[PDB]
């Protein structure tokens, strides 16, 4: 038993991390097959980042302007192209440690593991949930750009995030591996607003099932609710509306515990209106929305 | 910026995880050079675990009774020995992925990453802190025994923990890599009590420094207390007494923020005496003692 925020084993991703330097700017790159993917602001000087014209900046660069280092060995760049906010550097050597992979675009509420890197070297691994406003609460310092987010399904690494920036609220923003930002953000050093966040309801419910599986039951009772009436309470407390699709996704956890989804919704509705009154659920004094139903099934059944 | 509970990259350890089967019991082993380390209770049937005589149970096992698998490759067992609560199986092949390593015994308050494994396959990584009563709050299911805890210092993997059991309270217990349990626990299926816990004061202070480094300053106040006065408060709220050695270990964080340890102790004194009043620090509604000063320094620099 026990319930802990857990990251995927990072080994397969560690074998893909490289260092990319363009002039005075160094960041991380992801080496898959003969291509190194990295944030395009590697071509910027400090002043360029205030209002960069990336197409003009890239025209000024040639293959020899990109220093790519895999450990202590230099990889020769033989081609370069910009795709959205990502740079693709064709190298003359295919990564012998390339795992089976795919590039995916994730949705709000979904989680992924981040392998935080500096100078092409891995420093730590932690889990992130993509917020309703397309930001993540990570841990990223200077030089962390190009660090990636991923999920692993047995032997296949699904890359979903690449780190680009930190917003004025301390939250983090980035792109998918095709260079498209999650959210309304741009890679320019200018003040940018993230939308209002909303709590990921299906995830809070998933965590309440993880708590039940671990021995917590005080929030449980014979009360129930319609989907419509729970959604009125959800709007008041800034929670996402629960849909039949979300109820369906919670089915496996509901079957495992014998507690119907709308029965757990009645419990959640009560926790928001009445509060916890001095107690902790799974070591937390707050309701947590950073775990998906799949993250819960991963630790509470298999 | 941003402060997060973080595990070490696990690649080096993933390359050492194997599956160990003895009869109907399967768990994980750690393959270093030509030796596989695993919990000795792999030799037990479910009935044996209630009151095992490990010496007699092992005498009835031969090398052929142990099946060790690395991926889909059988590693032939050519020798077996028991050291405390660990079984050491000598195999016919040296692990070509053996990293540079040490076996260390950690103290309460110290942290490590656990690479949770099932059937010799790593499934997840998370950080654990060794509590004052020598237990950890982990996430371990059936077949997780043999999963290890470790710290990485650049290229060297310091293995400090091997998982063995879960206590009636839901907390977890295990041994160092020499098979000596942390705490008063024995590897027998019998109710065992963990000590009363005490909060790790120096870790709470390190986490308050992490909070200030990340813009969380509401709890900072204009007062500076003394070590003696802080210790009067700590003994009332079940916190460890702060020592000069602990103040010394906090030096780098105190220097990086320009906030003296006794200025931060006055913030902690006020948080304990007045409570957090429903307010949060680094997203938490509770004071956290799961981070060492080294974890805060390592993370806030980007080692
Ligand atoms: C990439 N290595 C860094 C990662 C940043 C550094 C501090 N924390 C992080 O996560 N990315 C940047 O420095 C990007 C980069 C220029 C500016 N920048 C920012 O993240 C800045 N933020 C913004 O300007 C904002 F708010 F719009 F997101 C900074 C003020 C430095 C935090 C570019 C090209 C966006
Ligand atoms: C090894 N794979 C498991 C890991 C356990 C399974 C559930 N969560 C865990 O951490 N270890 C065991 O099954 C050990 C093993 C016999 C019994 N045991 C326990 O963890 C039991 N606990 C105890 O008897 C206690 F309280 F003393 F710790 C159990 C009731 C199954 C949780 C031996 C040899 C200790």
XYZ file of C-alpha atoms and ligand atoms in Angstrom:
675
model
C 0.000 0.000 0.000
C 0.824 3.767 0.086
C 0.254 6.569 -2.425
C 3.109 8.676 -3.726
C 3.642 11.124 -6.606
C 5.818 9.009 -8.876
C 7.787 9.578 -12.060
C 8.530 7.073 -14.842
C 12.009 5.501 -14.803
C 14.114 8.033 -16.744
C 16.791 5.741 -18.268
C 15.438 5.645 -21.835
C 15.177 9.460 -21.906
C 18.631 9.996 -20.300
C 20.226 8.324 -23.360
C 18.703 11.025 -25.600
C 19.864 14.169 -23.756
C 22.477 16.348 -25.490
C 23.907 19.834 -24.945
C 23.278 22.489 -27.702
C 25.284 25.711 -27.861
C 24.737 28.534 -30.341
C 27.099 31.398 -29.600
C 26.803 32.321 -25.916
C 23.500 30.453 -25.313
C 23.558 26.829 -24.186
C 20.477 24.664 -23.574
C 19.398 21.003 -23.807
C 18.487 19.026 -26.908
C 16.705 15.687 -27.451
C 18.613 13.365 -29.862
C 16.345 10.801 -31.586
C 17.611 8.933 -34.671
C 19.779 11.543 -36.607
C 17.813 14.607 -35.405
C 18.424 16.841 -32.339
C 15.311 18.789 -31.252
C 15.756 21.926 -29.128
C 14.013 25.279 -28.350
C 14.603 27.810 -31.137
C 15.630 30.587 -28.714
C 19.080 28.839 -28.589
C 19.841 31.217 -31.575
C 19.145 34.318 -29.427
C 21.522 36.552 -27.554
C 20.105 38.074 -24.290
C 18.907 41.236 -26.152
C 17.406 39.225 -29.059
C 14.959 37.532 -26.633
C 13.182 40.837 -25.891
C 11.614 40.913 -29.419
C 13.215 38.245 -31.660
C 12.652 37.823 -35.396
C 13.456 34.119 -35.424
C 13.412 33.799 -39.229
C 16.087 36.570 -39.484
C 18.096 35.116 -36.624
C 18.118 31.656 -38.233
C 19.200 33.072 -41.640
C 22.382 34.340 -39.862
C 23.186 30.773 -38.678
C 24.910 27.940 -40.510
C 25.406 24.267 -39.449
C 28.825 25.103 -37.907
C 27.231 27.736 -35.628
C 25.570 24.895 -33.586
C 27.833 23.028 -31.173
C 26.052 19.744 -30.209
C 27.694 17.648 -27.485
C 26.664 14.082 -26.575
C 28.594 13.575 -23.342
C 32.207 14.431 -24.224
C 31.790 13.763 -28.002
C 30.840 16.477 -30.530
C 28.074 15.604 -33.055
C 28.357 17.269 -36.452
C 25.298 19.218 -37.569
C 24.644 18.669 -41.330
C 21.238 20.373 -41.689
C 18.936 22.710 -39.782
C 15.320 23.745 -39.931
C 12.776 25.541 -37.776
C 9.386 23.953 -37.134
C 7.130 26.277 -35.102
C 9.152 27.067 -31.851
C 11.527 24.115 -32.222
C 14.864 23.764 -34.007
C 15.638 20.476 -35.729
C 19.351 19.905 -36.188
C 20.139 16.999 -38.521
C 23.307 15.300 -37.230
C 25.629 12.883 -39.095
C 25.169 10.108 -36.460
C 21.955 8.334 -35.434
C 21.507 7.991 -31.644
C 22.324 4.365 -30.876
C 20.285 4.679 -27.660
C 17.120 5.931 -29.457
C 14.187 4.186 -27.759
C 10.908 3.298 -29.496
C 9.118 6.688 -29.412
C 6.271 8.901 -30.526
C 5.488 12.612 -30.250
C 2.112 13.322 -28.643
C 0.124 16.430 -27.762
C -1.449 16.052 -24.290
C -4.665 17.653 -22.898
C -5.216 19.611 -19.629
C -5.469 17.264 -16.652
C -2.941 14.785 -18.092
C 0.350 14.088 -16.325
C 3.909 13.440 -17.503
C 7.371 12.962 -16.052
C 9.922 15.754 -16.539
C 13.611 14.861 -16.729
C 15.171 18.199 -15.627
C 18.528 18.732 -17.448
C 21.440 21.235 -17.409
C 24.237 21.235 -20.074
C 22.809 18.049 -21.616
C 23.135 16.237 -18.256
C 20.170 14.869 -16.261
C 19.718 16.311 -12.771
C 16.337 15.015 -11.538
C 12.950 13.562 -12.396
C 9.493 14.642 -11.219
C 5.864 14.460 -12.256
C 3.804 17.366 -13.655
C 0.134 17.797 -14.506
C -0.764 20.100 -17.440
C -3.066 22.686 -15.787
C -6.427 23.870 -17.261
C -4.547 27.044 -18.330
C -1.789 25.049 -20.134
C 0.919 25.783 -17.561
C 2.795 23.345 -15.276
C 4.217 23.758 -11.765
C 7.769 22.513 -12.288
C 11.299 23.204 -11.135
C 13.322 24.861 -13.876
C 16.430 26.998 -13.572
C 18.597 28.837 -16.147
C 19.770 26.413 -18.851
C 16.833 24.006 -18.215
C 15.241 24.714 -21.631
C 15.061 21.722 -23.877
C 14.288 19.440 -20.871
C 11.406 17.148 -21.907
C 8.187 15.727 -20.502
C 7.135 12.169 -21.330
C 5.091 9.086 -20.507
C 6.292 5.476 -20.993
C 3.899 2.704 -22.069
C 6.030 -0.457 -21.559
C 8.934 0.196 -24.067
C 7.576 3.211 -25.976
C 8.483 6.725 -24.862
C 5.761 9.247 -25.714
C 7.331 12.694 -25.626
C 4.738 15.400 -24.910
C 6.559 18.471 -23.592
C 9.700 20.519 -24.152
C 10.532 23.316 -21.709
C 10.802 26.928 -22.974
C 9.903 29.536 -20.286
C 8.682 30.585 -16.861
C 5.654 32.940 -16.546
C 5.402 35.908 -14.118
C 3.346 33.800 -11.687
C 6.247 31.294 -11.287
C 4.541 28.675 -13.490
C 6.147 26.998 -16.498
C 5.330 26.876 -20.199
C 6.561 24.938 -23.214
C 5.708 23.188 -26.453
C 4.910 19.739 -27.828
C 7.861 18.180 -29.845
C 6.495 19.762 -33.063
C 7.193 23.212 -31.454
C 3.567 24.238 -30.860
C 3.066 25.944 -27.482
C 0.595 24.604 -24.983
C -1.535 27.688 -24.250
C -1.487 31.216 -25.687
C 2.222 31.747 -24.989
C 5.033 33.000 -27.262
C 8.821 32.600 -26.940
C 9.530 36.242 -26.307
C 10.677 37.925 -23.100
C 7.606 40.025 -22.583
C 4.964 39.923 -19.801
C 2.371 37.297 -20.638
C -0.788 36.339 -18.804
C -1.835 32.770 -18.155
C -5.620 32.289 -18.002
C -7.489 31.600 -14.734
C -6.884 28.062 -13.544
C -9.705 25.636 -12.667
C -9.339 22.462 -10.531
C -9.233 19.199 -12.567
C -12.347 17.499 -11.095
C -11.786 14.009 -12.570
C -8.278 14.008 -11.012
C -9.505 15.024 -7.553
C -12.049 12.176 -7.737
C -9.280 9.753 -8.822
C -7.199 10.799 -5.753
C -10.233 10.330 -3.433
C -10.469 6.732 -4.813
C -6.669 6.284 -4.108
C -7.361 7.483 -0.528
C -10.250 4.972 -0.108
C -8.059 2.117 -1.420
C -5.459 3.141 1.270
C -7.909 3.126 4.199
C -9.615 6.560 4.272
C -13.420 6.455 4.531
C -14.753 9.342 6.659
C -15.758 11.370 3.595
C -17.880 8.403 2.341
C -21.666 8.078 2.964
C -24.947 6.857 1.314
C -25.680 10.298 -0.236
C -25.518 10.696 -3.993
C -26.065 13.534 -6.576
C -27.005 14.016 -10.196
C -24.226 15.136 -12.567
C -26.105 18.486 -12.964
C -26.321 19.313 -9.206
C -22.661 18.438 -8.499
C -21.697 20.756 -11.425
C -23.477 23.712 -9.684
C -21.277 23.201 -6.596
C -18.241 22.670 -8.892
C -18.827 26.084 -10.588
C -18.959 27.794 -7.173
C -15.617 26.293 -6.094
C -13.889 26.749 -9.476
C -13.807 23.051 -10.382
C -14.191 21.788 -13.958
C -17.677 20.486 -14.828
C -17.879 16.677 -14.658
C -19.082 15.002 -17.870
C -20.358 11.441 -18.593
C -17.037 10.851 -20.435
C -15.142 11.681 -17.165
C -17.538 9.475 -15.119
C -16.805 6.618 -17.623
C -13.029 7.076 -17.207
C -13.424 6.678 -13.423
C -15.287 3.327 -13.967
C -12.309 1.015 -13.182
C -11.604 2.732 -9.844
C -15.340 2.779 -9.041
C -15.608 -0.980 -9.802
C -12.486 -1.767 -7.723
C -13.792 0.013 -4.585
C -17.507 -0.589 -5.062
C -18.204 3.200 -4.714
C -20.172 4.694 -7.657
C -18.758 7.839 -9.318
C -21.757 10.026 -8.371
C -21.446 8.658 -4.814
C -17.812 9.923 -4.677
C -19.126 13.226 -6.256
C -21.525 13.619 -3.313
C -18.489 13.139 -1.015
C -16.425 15.734 -2.958
C -19.369 18.198 -2.947
C -19.452 17.828 0.893
C -15.662 18.302 1.265
C -15.837 21.616 -0.639
C -18.913 22.975 1.273
C -17.948 21.789 4.778
C -14.116 21.625 4.555
C -11.918 18.901 6.136
C -12.162 20.169 9.798
C -8.552 19.434 10.883
C -7.875 16.170 9.002
C -5.430 14.958 6.234
C -6.248 12.748 3.194
C -3.131 10.790 2.016
C -0.794 13.105 3.956
C -2.357 16.268 2.487
C -4.480 19.005 4.127
C -5.748 20.105 0.647
C -7.587 18.279 -2.151
C -5.052 17.197 -4.808
C -5.795 17.301 -8.583
C -2.341 16.315 -9.936
C -3.127 12.562 -10.320
C -5.071 11.078 -13.246
C -7.270 7.955 -12.940
C -4.476 6.055 -14.790
C -1.834 7.295 -12.267
C -4.090 5.958 -9.487
C -4.701 2.548 -11.199
C -0.874 2.320 -11.713
C -0.274 2.285 -7.881
C -3.531 1.015 -6.398
C -4.068 -2.211 -8.391
C -0.866 -2.978 -10.340
C 12.441 28.863 -10.119
C 9.988 26.321 -8.634
C 10.695 23.794 -5.876
C 9.681 20.198 -6.358
C 10.207 16.826 -4.695
C 12.568 15.277 -7.159
C 14.153 11.869 -7.669
C 17.651 11.238 -9.039
C 17.746 10.092 -12.701
C 17.287 6.306 -12.428
C 19.059 4.950 -15.561
C 22.136 3.655 -13.706
C 19.992 1.677 -11.274
C 17.550 0.394 -13.942
C 20.514 -1.458 -15.515
C 21.022 -3.393 -12.247
C 17.453 -4.653 -11.620
C 16.775 -8.374 -12.040
C 13.938 -10.789 -11.201
C 14.602 -13.423 -8.500
C 12.324 -16.431 -8.129
C 12.533 -19.187 -5.524
C 9.669 -21.675 -5.850
C 6.438 -19.691 -5.879
C 7.947 -16.430 -4.483
C 9.191 -13.797 -6.966
C 10.768 -10.480 -6.057
C 13.514 -8.081 -7.257
C 17.268 -8.333 -6.998
C 20.139 -5.879 -7.504
C 22.815 -7.214 -9.888
C 26.290 -5.665 -9.239
C 29.398 -7.345 -10.734
C 28.758 -11.163 -10.417
C 26.453 -10.868 -7.359
C 22.671 -10.462 -7.071
C 21.434 -8.992 -3.753
C 17.841 -9.671 -2.672
C 15.650 -9.949 0.487
C 16.169 -13.368 2.163
C 12.406 -13.961 2.469
C 12.387 -14.967 -1.241
C 13.059 -18.528 0.166
C 9.789 -18.480 2.182
C 6.413 -19.904 1.283
C 3.479 -17.751 2.628
C 3.298 -20.070 5.695
C 7.048 -19.808 6.393
C 6.851 -15.976 6.693
C 4.786 -16.175 9.928
C 7.794 -17.509 11.937
C 10.724 -18.340 9.640
C 13.889 -20.116 10.720
C 15.944 -18.628 7.841
C 19.042 -20.705 8.512
C 17.102 -24.002 8.240
C 15.010 -22.763 5.309
C 18.132 -21.818 3.353
C 19.864 -25.161 4.120
C 17.081 -26.894 2.111
C 17.693 -24.697 -0.974
C 20.305 -25.415 -3.641
C 21.591 -23.065 -6.402
C 18.999 -24.691 -8.779
C 16.127 -23.474 -6.539
C 16.937 -19.809 -7.519
C 15.920 -18.547 -10.955
C 17.488 -15.124 -11.764
C 16.441 -13.259 -14.888
C 17.852 -10.043 -16.438
C 15.302 -9.052 -19.096
C 14.745 -12.365 -20.915
C 18.221 -13.773 -20.041
C 18.728 -16.395 -17.360
C 21.693 -15.707 -15.085
C 22.966 -19.045 -13.755
C 23.279 -19.103 -9.940
C 26.603 -20.669 -8.949
C 26.737 -19.731 -5.245
C 24.476 -18.491 -2.448
C 25.041 -16.978 0.973
C 22.974 -15.143 3.575
C 24.284 -11.908 5.154
C 21.894 -10.651 7.888
C 18.478 -10.244 6.033
C 19.988 -10.230 2.543
C 20.580 -13.180 0.236
C 23.638 -12.948 -2.046
C 23.471 -15.052 -5.173
C 26.739 -15.405 -7.085
C 25.952 -15.625 -10.805
C 28.020 -16.837 -13.782
C 28.025 -13.370 -15.473
C 29.263 -9.966 -14.293
C 26.724 -7.153 -14.958
C 28.254 -5.166 -17.872
C 26.186 -2.140 -16.785
C 27.516 -2.126 -13.153
C 27.926 1.562 -12.301
C 30.562 2.918 -9.923
C 28.878 2.264 -6.514
C 29.051 2.214 -2.721
C 26.833 0.632 -0.049
C 26.091 3.170 2.670
C 23.992 3.280 5.826
C 21.994 6.512 6.116
C 20.689 8.265 9.253
C 17.165 9.567 10.054
C 16.469 12.858 8.293
C 18.366 11.753 5.169
C 16.689 11.283 1.789
C 17.089 8.881 -1.202
C 15.339 7.905 -4.430
C 13.440 4.628 -4.564
C 13.202 2.858 -7.898
C 9.975 0.839 -7.384
C 10.192 -2.470 -9.335
C 7.950 -5.469 -10.010
C 9.119 -8.747 -11.648
C 12.568 -7.175 -12.095
C 11.165 -4.287 -14.164
C 11.290 -0.690 -12.928
C 7.865 0.907 -12.817
C 8.447 4.271 -11.071
C 10.801 6.579 -9.138
C 10.130 8.748 -6.079
C 11.932 10.369 -3.172
C 11.733 9.048 0.405
C 12.901 10.550 3.699
C 14.066 8.208 6.530
C 11.912 9.211 9.528
C 13.223 9.515 13.147
C 11.677 6.049 13.811
C 13.558 4.492 10.811
C 10.504 4.083 8.595
C 9.662 5.650 5.216
C 6.357 6.666 3.673
C 6.556 4.824 0.340
C 4.301 3.159 -2.241
C 4.980 -0.560 -2.411
C 2.689 -3.404 -3.535
C 3.056 -7.242 -3.566
C 6.317 -8.230 -5.307
C 8.047 -4.828 -4.674
C 10.630 -6.335 -2.264
C 14.178 -5.991 -3.480
C 13.449 -2.474 -4.885
C 16.312 -0.210 -3.783
C 16.921 3.293 -2.466
C 19.935 5.320 -3.595
C 21.665 8.661 -3.961
C 23.806 9.646 -6.969
C 26.890 11.868 -6.542
C 27.767 12.677 -10.205
C 28.907 9.167 -11.351
C 28.778 7.085 -8.094
C 25.574 5.334 -6.981
C 25.383 5.064 -3.196
C 22.823 2.346 -2.456
C 21.330 2.820 0.980
C 18.045 0.936 1.137
C 16.478 -2.368 0.071
C 12.711 -2.807 0.544
C 11.442 -5.652 2.782
C 8.049 -4.885 4.467
C 5.061 -2.682 5.336
C 4.098 -1.980 8.968
C 0.495 -2.048 10.325
C 0.488 1.773 10.226
C 1.026 1.779 6.421
C 4.701 2.844 6.657
C 7.606 0.972 5.069
C 10.713 -0.720 6.421
C 13.838 -2.241 4.988
C 17.571 -2.809 5.301
C 20.876 -1.352 4.102
C 22.663 -3.417 1.365
C 24.426 -5.461 4.089
C 20.968 -6.734 5.184
C 20.812 -4.834 8.493
C 17.384 -3.392 9.146
C 16.913 0.266 9.727
C 15.073 0.348 13.037
C 13.996 -2.440 15.385
C 12.221 -4.478 12.701
C 12.586 -8.171 11.882
C 11.647 -9.882 8.589
C 8.806 -11.967 10.036
C 5.057 -11.570 9.428
C 4.240 -10.440 13.002
C 2.827 -7.096 14.254
C 5.670 -4.680 14.868
C 5.539 -1.183 16.258
C 7.518 1.766 14.931
C 8.715 4.324 17.468
C 7.002 7.655 18.218
C 8.268 10.011 15.479
C 9.883 13.433 15.961
C 9.908 16.195 13.307
C 13.319 16.771 11.601
C 13.859 20.429 12.540
C 16.796 21.087 10.242
C 14.794 19.824 7.221
C 11.830 22.103 8.063
C 14.222 25.070 8.141
C 15.828 23.990 4.811
C 12.318 23.876 3.258
C 11.554 27.390 4.628
C 14.774 28.555 2.864
C 13.527 26.811 -0.373
C 10.247 28.725 0.059
C 12.031 32.106 0.360
C 14.267 31.312 -2.660
C 10.956 30.784 -4.606
C 9.140 33.965 -3.529
C 7.122 32.615 -0.605
C 7.877 35.211 2.119
C 4.630 35.795 4.095
C 6.015 33.859 7.095
C 9.189 36.001 7.349
C 9.176 38.340 10.366
C 11.405 41.111 11.823
C 12.427 39.013 14.858
C 15.565 36.972 15.484
C 15.444 34.336 18.248
C 18.243 32.423 20.097
C 19.088 28.720 19.763
C 18.136 28.141 23.437
C 14.774 29.897 23.157
C 13.938 28.048 19.880
C 14.695 24.710 21.625
C 12.155 25.492 24.400
C 9.491 25.750 21.622
C 10.749 22.682 19.666
C 10.429 20.250 22.629
C 6.737 21.289 23.051
C 5.810 20.697 19.388
C 7.697 17.360 19.072
C 10.517 18.747 16.893
C 14.163 17.593 17.265
C 16.362 20.030 19.236
C 18.398 22.262 16.889
C 22.161 21.769 17.391
C 25.144 23.961 16.340
C 25.994 21.204 13.786
C 22.479 21.671 12.258
C 22.873 25.488 12.192
C 26.273 24.894 10.428
C 24.701 22.614 7.781
C 22.156 25.445 7.081
C 25.048 27.938 6.440
C 25.005 27.774 2.598
C 21.213 28.459 2.425
C 21.491 31.203 5.048
C 24.287 32.824 2.941
C 22.406 32.445 -0.396
C 19.264 34.183 0.948
C 20.959 36.584 3.387
C 18.596 35.300 6.112
C 20.297 34.221 9.323
C 19.392 30.815 10.761
C 18.077 32.434 13.968
C 15.992 34.937 11.881
C 14.438 31.846 10.115
C 14.023 30.098 13.529
C 11.816 33.031 14.654
C 9.594 32.352 11.557
C 9.372 28.656 12.555
C 8.635 29.532 16.198
C 5.696 31.749 15.046
C 4.436 29.055 12.612
C 4.412 26.516 15.457
C 2.921 28.784 18.183
C 0.257 30.453 16.009
C -0.295 27.654 13.459
C -0.382 28.064 9.683
C -4.000 29.446 9.906
C -5.004 27.704 6.665
C -2.203 29.492 4.756
C 0.199 27.614 2.408
C 4.003 27.486 1.809
C 5.268 26.000 -1.512
C 1.684 24.766 -2.161
C 1.574 22.911 1.177
C -0.805 23.475 4.087
C 1.651 21.603 6.436
C 5.275 22.194 7.490
C 7.375 19.686 5.504
C 10.392 17.882 6.910
C 11.110 15.629 3.888
C 13.894 17.769 2.375
C 17.479 17.967 3.595
C 19.607 21.173 3.302
C 21.669 19.319 0.662
C 18.486 18.584 -1.373
C 17.545 22.294 -1.261
C 21.095 23.502 -2.232
C 21.498 20.778 -4.991
C 18.109 21.710 -6.483
C 18.351 25.525 -6.188
C 21.739 25.480 -8.074
C 21.031 22.713 -10.631
C 23.757 20.134 -9.886
C 15.362 28.289 -20.741
N 16.502 27.746 -20.476
C 14.780 29.338 -19.838
C 14.097 28.700 -18.637
C 13.610 29.772 -17.686
C 14.789 30.423 -16.951
C 14.260 30.745 -15.563
N 13.208 29.779 -15.372
C 12.855 29.121 -16.538
O 12.079 28.184 -16.632
N 13.862 30.092 -20.658
C 13.940 31.461 -20.726
O 14.784 32.138 -20.161
C 12.855 32.064 -21.567
C 13.385 32.514 -22.898
C 13.359 34.011 -22.949
C 12.840 34.539 -21.643
N 12.495 33.316 -20.879
C 11.726 33.257 -19.740
O 11.343 32.187 -19.301
C 11.364 34.570 -19.082
N 9.934 34.536 -18.975
C 9.192 35.356 -19.777
O 9.652 36.282 -20.428
C 7.727 35.050 -19.730
F 7.172 35.525 -18.599
F 7.060 35.596 -20.779
F 7.435 33.726 -19.746
C 12.083 34.833 -17.767
C 11.724 36.227 -17.308
C 13.582 34.734 -17.963
C 11.656 33.882 -16.659
C 12.504 33.220 -23.927
C 12.971 33.206 -25.332
C 11.022 33.158 -23.735
C 7.739 -7.766 -0.430
N 7.534 -7.959 -1.689
C 6.603 -7.387 0.478
C 6.280 -5.903 0.356
C 5.012 -5.603 1.142
C 3.751 -6.105 0.397
C 2.686 -5.070 0.742
N 3.449 -3.855 0.869
C 4.788 -4.102 1.162
O 5.648 -3.268 1.414
N 7.013 -7.725 1.833
C 6.256 -8.603 2.554
O 5.278 -9.180 2.117
C 6.769 -8.799 3.950
C 7.394 -10.153 4.114
C 6.549 -10.974 5.038
C 5.331 -10.170 5.409
N 5.612 -8.822 4.867
C 4.913 -7.661 5.120
O 5.236 -6.586 4.628
C 3.731 -7.796 6.052
N 4.036 -6.869 7.115
C 4.351 -7.359 8.347
O 4.148 -8.515 8.699
C 4.934 -6.337 9.269
F 3.971 -5.625 9.878
F 5.670 -6.921 10.243
F 5.767 -5.444 8.689
C 2.406 -7.518 5.355
C 1.305 -7.758 6.365
C 2.205 -8.477 4.208
C 2.289 -6.091 4.855
C 7.967 -10.605 5.456
C 8.973 -11.697 5.426
C 8.143 -9.584 6.538
